Structures are given as C-alpha cells and as structure tokens.
Design an enzyme around this catalytic site. Structure first.
Site, PDB file in Angstrom:
ATOM      1  N   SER A 102      29.209  25.745  40.347  1.00  0.00           N
ATOM      2  CA  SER A 102      29.526  26.972  41.052  1.00  0.00           C
ATOM      3  C   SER A 102      28.276  27.433  41.799  1.00  0.00           C
ATOM      4  O   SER A 102      27.740  26.701  42.639  1.00  0.00           O
ATOM      5  CB  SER A 102      29.999  28.038  40.057  1.00  0.00           C
ATOM      6  OG  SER A 102      30.796  29.006  40.717  1.00  0.00           O
ATOM      7  N   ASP A 241      40.830  24.916  40.802  1.00  0.00           N
ATOM      8  CA  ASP A 241      39.499  25.517  40.781  1.00  0.00           C
ATOM      9  C   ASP A 241      39.454  26.780  41.641  1.00  0.00           C
ATOM     10  O   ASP A 241      40.025  26.787  42.729  1.00  0.00           O
ATOM     11  CB  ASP A 241      38.469  24.485  41.249  1.00  0.00           C
ATOM     12  CG  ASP A 241      37.057  24.899  40.936  1.00  0.00           C
ATOM     13  OD1 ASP A 241      36.270  24.033  40.480  1.00  0.00           O
ATOM     14  OD2 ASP A 241      36.731  26.087  41.146  1.00  0.00           O
ATOM     15  N   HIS A 268      38.008  25.735  37.381  1.00  0.00           N
ATOM     16  CA  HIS A 268      36.571  25.805  37.650  1.00  0.00           C
ATOM     17  C   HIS A 268      35.720  25.088  36.619  1.00  0.00           C
ATOM     18  O   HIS A 268      34.990  24.156  36.951  1.00  0.00           O
ATOM     19  CB  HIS A 268      36.135  27.259  37.735  1.00  0.00           C
ATOM     20  CG  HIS A 268      34.784  27.447  38.343  1.00  0.00           C
ATOM     21  ND1 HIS A 268      34.463  26.973  39.595  1.00  0.00           N
ATOM     22  CD2 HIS A 268      33.677  28.088  37.887  1.00  0.00           C
ATOM     23  CE1 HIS A 268      33.219  27.313  39.886  1.00  0.00           C
ATOM     24  NE2 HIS A 268      32.720  27.988  38.868  1.00  0.00           N
TER      25      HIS A 268
HETATM   26  C1  LIG Z   1      29.816  32.601  43.466  1.00  0.00           C
HETATM   27  C2  LIG Z   1      30.734  32.660  42.291  1.00  0.00           C
HETATM   28  C3  LIG Z   1      32.108  32.119  42.662  1.00  0.00           C
HETATM   29  C4  LIG Z   1      30.146  31.854  41.129  1.00  0.00           C
HETATM   30  C5  LIG Z   1      30.745  32.158  39.753  1.00  0.00           C
HETATM   31  N1  LIG Z   1      30.131  33.389  39.193  1.00  0.00           N
HETATM   32  C6  LIG Z   1      30.559  30.970  38.813  1.00  0.00           C
HETATM   33  O1  LIG Z   1      29.417  30.739  38.393  1.00  0.00           O
HETATM   34  O2  LIG Z   1      31.554  30.298  38.481  1.00  0.00           O
END
Ligand SMILES: CC(C)C[C@H](N)C(=O)O
Length: 290
Positions: A102, A241, A268
């Site tokens: 991420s 995701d 994700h």
């Molecule tokens: C920029 C965001 C989509 C990142 C999210 N906080 C994660 O680390 O999954």
C-alpha cells in the site's frame, strides 16, 4: 527468533525487526503502508525465512514503536532517506529486495526511483504511483457498495462525523470487503491499525480513514518517473483490493519487465488472505532474480 532493536537512523530512533534466514540466499526489506501504521501486519512474510530469505521489518518515522520526527519531515522523500539510511546502517552496500505494501509500496517506488542500485528486486503489493488515481478508483468502489453504506459514507463523511456508528458501520463493511475479505482479522493486523489510530503520521499524511485521503499526500503522484525503474519488479494486488488492480496496472505499464499478479478472492492484505500463496510468489520471484 528475530533480532530486535531501537537504533538511531538518519536522525531519529527507528525500531526494526531482522529475522535472519537460516541459510539465507537473499535479504528482503519491507515497508508497511498507511502512512502511519507498523510492520506488525507484515509479519506473515516471516515464513519466507524458511525459503532462505531474511526479512527486515521496521516502523517508519513516527510509526509503531519508532520516534516521531519534525512534522516538516513528514514527507515521502524523507521515508526514502530513512529507508536508505537503515539499509546502509544494517547492510552497508549490499543489494537487497525491497517490498512495500500500500503506502509502503508507493514509498518503495519512490525509493527505487532514487536508489534502485541498492536493489536486486522490487515488490509492490497494493501499492500505487498516484494518490489521486487511487482515490479516483476508491470512489468507484464506494459507489459500488450497497446504497445503505455508500450513502452513509457520503453523508457523515461530509459532516466530518467519522465517530458516528452508522458511518463506522459502512467503514467496517468496506474494510471486510476490500481491506481483508471474509476473515477474522489476526492480531498483527489489528496491531498496526491500533498504532495508526494512536500516532499522528496517519492523521496528518493520510487523513481520516482509507477511502478518506485528505492528508498531505492527497496529491502525490510520480507516475511520470517510475518508468526509470529497471530492476526486477513484482506487482501484486487483490481482486477486490481497495487499491484496485487498475491502479496496479499504471505501475506495471510503466515499469518494463515487471510482473503483475492479481490475487483472486483476495483484497488489500493478500499476505494474510493467502499467506502461503502470497509468500510463495514473493519467494519464487526473489530467488528467481537472485
Ligand atoms: C494510501 C492508503 C490507501 C494506504 C493504506 N492506509 C494502507 O496502508 O493500506
């Protein structure tokens, strides 16, 4: 077990977890997402030490158990320098594999763009090259959710009422949909979330929640620079995701020779929804570009 320590890196004190691999063939550095979470939710990658892969876990500036720097330094470019500083402080001039998740992924790209030399390979999971893009994609996801939750996000979201339960309901629903599909969330993940909601990095750089990116990174975008990356790169992303595969595509399309693996039935945090499968892919990749 893994060696732990709270050392000074490029100025402030950063905590790191180095799980040396028995008969290691390569060393992998990791970058958690957020920004403003912790390495905790990436501990599943530890399994890769059984494949002779040493995994370096660490909490970025102002994250987890690490010291918080001057709020002026709450920038991605700063994370990059911190990362390099740590890499050198621990491995001097040895080339390693860099994995980001991420935000971590986006952070990794930024690093590669500048220090791809110190890299034998790059891995971006649920990463992104542009926040605006990811945001654009996240909106689509929001609207795609059932009206009940969808509108809930739009209502309280505009009133800045994230504390509201009707809102929290939607948020959590979305989470169990695009963040960690039909699972009973492991501690490590709930550990990183607990940290973000405790530290200031997330609040400042990211903002309220996931789909509510209004932080300082709101407009970050280096798509027009990631092409400069030439080292082996593995881009992974879950079918559902939150940082849609479409986003991962933009990265794959720019980085030549890169691979792109979409994890079906995964969201994700694929490293948990398919720990064995996820770990195998990375290890194969890593050892493949040894
Ligand atoms: C920029 C965001 C989509 C990142 C999210 N906080 C994660 O680390 O999954």
């Amino acid at each position: 077990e893994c060696i732990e320590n709270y050392a000074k890196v490029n100025g402030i004190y950063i905590y790191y977890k180095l799980c040396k691999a028995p008969e290691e063939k390569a060393k992998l550095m990791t970058m958690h997402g957020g920004p403003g979470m912790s390495h905790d939710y990436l501990l599943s990658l530890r399994d890769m030490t059984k494949e002779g892969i040493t995994v370096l876990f660490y909490d970025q500036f102002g994250c987890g158990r690490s010291e918080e720097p001057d709020q002026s330094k709450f920038t991605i470019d700063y994370g990059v320098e911190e990362a390099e500083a740590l890499r050198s402080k621990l491995f001097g001039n040895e080339k390693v594999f860099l994995m980001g998740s991420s935000y971590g992924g986006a952070l990794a790209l930024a690093y590669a763009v500048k220090y791809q030399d110190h890299l034998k390979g790059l891995i971006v999971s649920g990463g992104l090259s542009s926040v605006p893009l990811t945001v654009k994609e996240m909106n689509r996801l929001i609207d795609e959710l059932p009206a009940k939750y969808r509108d809930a996000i739009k209502k309280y979201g505009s009133s800045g009422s994230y504390e509201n339960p009707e809102y929290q309901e939607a948020v959590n629903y979305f989470y169990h949909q695009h963040l960690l599909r039909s699972e009973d969330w492991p501690p490590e993940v709930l550990k990183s979330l607990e940290y973000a909601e405790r530290r200031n990095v997330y609040r400042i750089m990211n903002g309220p929640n996931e789909f509510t990116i209004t932080g300082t990174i709101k407009d970050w975008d280096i798509t027009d620079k990631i092409s400069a990356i030439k080292i082996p790169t593995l881009i992974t992303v879950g079918e559902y995701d939150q940082v849609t595969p479409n986003v991962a595509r933009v990265i794959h399309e720019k980085i030549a020779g890169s691979e792109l693996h979409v994890f079906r039935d995964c969201s994700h945090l694929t490293m948990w929804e398919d720990r064995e499968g996820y770990n195998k892919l990375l290890s194969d990749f890593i050892l493949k570009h040894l």
